Amino acid sequence: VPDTPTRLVFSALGPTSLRVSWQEPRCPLQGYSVEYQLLNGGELHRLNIPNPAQTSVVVEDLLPNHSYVFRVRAQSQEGWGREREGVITIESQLPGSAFTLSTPSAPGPLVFTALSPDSLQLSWERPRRPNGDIVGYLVTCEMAQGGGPATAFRVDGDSPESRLTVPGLSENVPYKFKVQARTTEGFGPEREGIITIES
């Protein structure tokens, strides 16, 4: 049967809409099935993706501040494969975005400050409901252009708020940052964003 999707990405387009993306191993398929429903009681929505080349879909008319569960499966001639599951919420009422994604097991929204033309500080809130007690966080930094190597910072500790200063950066260059909690068992969901320092 088809393998489970190896990755499930969420990106908020607005306070009531997001793009769901997934990734299937390079190794047919007929398509995908994307299921979602409110976590506090609601009908099951099932989206059928009849093209295996399509690995993303937009979902609109979502309720703000309501937790949803998303399930993505792949289909082939043999049958359906196991699903990758994800819980997420679009929260909405500090400069920045008025709406933010949140899942209980991921770090809080990323707050960036450009301390200088070649350095910044990043802070994030502790996960609301982590899967296992936290040992620390892994923070990775890399050029969004590609090719260049990534830098991985280990942030030991389980503070309610964690902070990291990143030196050696270049102005006008986009950098992709990833933050994920390290727990006793393994890692949690990672929050990712691209920034650029300018004056």
Binding site: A114, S123, E190, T196
Partner: peptide, 23 residues
């Protein structure tokens, strides 16, 4: 590819960030 501009001396900015499950 959404990029968030960080301006020096403008203070902290809360960026909109993607969440990823798995790898």
């Amino acid at each position: 590819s959404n990029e968030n501009l960080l301006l020096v001396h403008c203070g902290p900015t809360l960026i909109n960030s993607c969440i990823s499950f798995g790898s």
